[PDB]
């Protein structure tokens, strides 16, 4: 749009608003899917469907040359403050789930453990580690660690915006033998600004250089960092007439 063309810009914002609403539908749908909640899942998929229809209607009016569709505001109940109720408002949880086929020299008794480093106030702190699984290239750690955050501190918001959690995978050197760094995994925290968990599997790295196997990890909060402004969107749900 030309910067003086206000009706054009309204049209752009209509589409942006609906695209943001679509994103919220899919995210929430995906949270309910991950939690074995079939009914919430279909619910927010159906909400996504209606948002997409309106998105298509607006794009179509623009593809031809018709007036923008009339619209109005409604509300939608997302329950953003209450996904992962198992967690305090102040709590971030890290789950080291499993290693997958580390590229080591041993088959069995490769013995492994994972160190976790989570940045805290005035860089940094919080460090911990998993137990030592024994005798497998594909370990099944299943350990959860909780830490305290301050959503209020703008430098904690810094950390979620820009920074991440470091996972170091170590082989347990035996008698008079030190431990070997098998590989590193670094997971950015910023998806937690609008989502309430990260869950993926990541390649063990050396540099700059993929090592071999993978590590599967979860990072979970009670609600997204930017829950407050997500709620504002849900209070003015843009919906086309009719």
Numbering used by the authors: 575 to 816
Give sentences from the paper.
We then explored functional determinants shared by the Lgd/CC2D1 family, thereby performing structural studies of the highly conserved C-terminal region of the Drosophila ortholog Lgd. The structure revealed an α-helical N-terminal domain that contains a ∼50 Å long helical hairpin, followed by a long coil structure arranged anti-parallel to the hairpin which connects to the C2 domain at amino acid 664. The C2 domain of Lgd forms a classical β-sandwich structure with two four-stranded β sheets that classifies as a class II C2 domain with N and C termini oriented at the bottom of the sandwich and opposite to the top loops, similar to the topology of the phospholipase C-δ1 C2 domain (Essen et al., 1996). The Lgd C2 domain is atypical as two short α helices are inserted into the loops connecting β strands 5 with 6 (α3) and β- 7 with 8 (η2). The convex part of the C2 domain is rigidly connected to the N-terminal α-helical domain via multiple interactions.
In this work, we have explored the function of coiled-coil- and C2 domain-containing protein B (CC2D1B), a poorly characterized member of the Lgd/CC2D1 family of proteins that also includes the closely related human CC2D1A and its D. melanogaster ortholog Lgd. Therefore, we reveal CC2D1B as an essential regulatory factor that licenses the formation of ESCRT-III polymers to ensure the orderly reformation of the NE.
